[PDB]
A paper describes a structure:
Spliceosomal proteins [name] and [name] are components of [name], which together with SF3a, Msl1p/Lea1p, Sm proteins, and U2 snRNA, form U2 [name], which plays a crucial role in pre-mRNA splicing. [name], comprising two RRMs, forms a heterodimer with [name]. The structures show that the [name] fragment binds to the α-helical surface of [name] RRM1, opposite the four-stranded β-sheet, leaving the canonical RNA-binding surface available to bind RNA. [name] binds the 5′ end region of U2 snRNA via RRM1.
The [name]–[name](290–368)p construct yielded small needle-like trigonal crystals, which diffracted to a maximum resolution of 2.7 Å, but at this point we were unable to solve the structure by molecular replacement or isomorphous replacement, partly due to twinning. Restrained twin refinement led to a final model with R/Rfree of 18.4/23.3. All three molecules in the asymmetric unit are very similar, with average overall RMSDs for the main chain of 0.45 Å for [name] and 0.23 Å for [name](290–368)p. The refined model contains residues 8–86 of RRM1, 106–185 of RRM2, and residues 187–205 of a C-terminal extension of RRM2. No density was observed for the first seven residues of RRM1, the linker connecting RRM1 and RRM2 and the last eight C-terminal residues of [name]. In RRM2, the β2/β3 loop is disordered and density for one residue is missing from the linker between β4 and the C-terminal extension. This C-terminal extension of RRM2 (186–205) forms an α-helix, which folds back and wedges between RRM1 and RRM2, interacting with RRM1 via the β1/α1 and α2/β4 loops and more extensively with the longer β2/β3 loop. In addition, there is an interaction between the β-sheet face of RRM1 and a symmetry related [name](290–368)p in the [name]–[name](290–368)p crystals. The buried surface area of this interface is about 505 Å2, but a complex formation significance of zero implies it is likely a result of crystal packing. The flexible linker between RRM1 and RRM2 is about 20 amino acids long and should allow independent movement of the two RRMs, indicating that the relative orientation of both RRMs held together by the C-terminal helix in the crystal structure was indeed most likely due to crystal packing interactions.
Author numbering:
A (entry chain A): 8 to 86, 106 to 144, 147 to 185, 187 to 205
B (entry chain B): 289 to 350
C-alpha cells in the first residue's frame, strides 16, 4: 500500500541517487534496490517504501512517465522486452499467422498488434528475449511471406535492442 | 539531501539544464503539492522564480 515498484532504471543508478530523486516527491522510509550477486550490478528495478498509502499514491500519479534517468523513462506502479516492427504484411496474414511465424524463434510475451500506415499493413511483435528476437530478424528481414516482401527490425521506443538491455538478461535470470 | 535541492550529478543524469524546473513540477500544478510536504515552495509555482538558483528549485518554508 505504501510501497511502489520502480522500473526501467539504468544499472549505473546508485541507491543514494534513488533516495535523492524520490525524496523530492515525498519522504521515504526505505529502499530495496536488488543487486545481482554474480554480476555485482543492479537489475533494473527497485521498491520504494513511503510512510503511508497516500504518499505512495501521490508518487505514482506524479512520477509515472515523467523522469528520464540516463535518457530512459522511469516507470512507477503500485504493489524490458524485445519489440520488433514488421512492415508490409499481406492481407492474408492474421494475428494468428504472426504468432505461428515468430513462435518458432522464441516465446512471445503478448499477442501481436496490427496497424496500418500510409495501405501499408504493419505489426508489433513482442519477444521475451533479445537473443530470440535477433534470430527472427536474421531469418525474416527482407523475406517473402504470402507473396509480400517484409522488413523486420527493432521498434522505436531511439531504438529497442540497446546495450542497456542486459535488463532483459537480469529479468530472464530472475524469472520476470 | 533535501526536497527542493538536486545535485549537479543527478541533474546530469536527468538531462535537466540549469534554470529549469524538474519535469515533475508541471504535474504538481494539476495534481497538487506533495502530500508529505504541505509547506513545500517551488520557484515559479508558489515561490518567486528568482529563488531558482544552482541546485535549488524549492524549499520547505511554512
Amino acid at each position: 500500500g505504501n510501497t511502489v515498484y520502480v522500473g526501467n532504471i539504468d544499472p549505473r543508478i546508485t541507491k543514494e541517487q534513488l533516495y535523492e530523486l524520490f525524496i523530492q516527491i515525498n519522504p521515504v522510509l526505505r529502499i530495496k534496490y536488488p543487486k545481482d550477486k554474480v554480476l555485482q550490478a543492479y537489475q533494473g528495478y527497485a521498491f520504494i517504501e513511503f510512510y503511508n498509502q497516500g504518499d505512495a499514491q501521490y508518487a505514482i500519479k506524479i512520477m509515472n512517465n515523467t523522469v528520464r534517468l540516463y535518457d530512459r523513462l522511469i516507470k512507477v506502479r503500485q504493489v524490458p522486452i524485445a519489440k520488433l516492427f514488421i512492415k508490409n504484411l499481406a492481407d492474408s496474414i492474421d494475428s494468428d499467422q504472426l504468432v505461428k511465424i515468430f513462435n518458432k524463434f522464441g516465446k512471445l510475451i503478448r499477442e501481436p498488434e496490427i496497424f496500418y500506415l500510409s495501405k501499408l499493413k504493419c505489426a508489433y511483435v513482442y519477444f521475451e528475449d533479445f537473443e530470440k528476437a535477433d534470430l527472427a530478424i536474421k531469418s525474416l528481414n527482407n523475406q517473402l511471406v504470402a507473396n509480400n516482401r517484409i522488413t523486420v527490425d527493432y521498434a522505436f521506443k531511439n531504438g529497442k535492442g540497446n546495450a542497456k538491455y542486459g535488463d532483459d538478461v537480469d529479468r530472464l535470470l530472475n524469472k520476470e | 539531501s533535501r526536497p527542493g535541492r538536486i545535485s549537479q550529478e543527478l541533474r546530469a543524469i536527468m538531462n535537466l539544464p540549469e534554470g529549469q524546473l524538474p519535469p515533475w513540477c508541471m504535474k504538481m500544478k494539476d495534481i497538487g503539492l506533495p502530500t508529505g510536504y504541505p509547506d513545500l515552495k517551488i520557484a515559479g509555482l508558489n515561490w518567486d522564480i528568482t529563488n531558482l538558483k544552482g541546485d535549488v528549485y524549492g524549499k520547505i518554508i511554512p
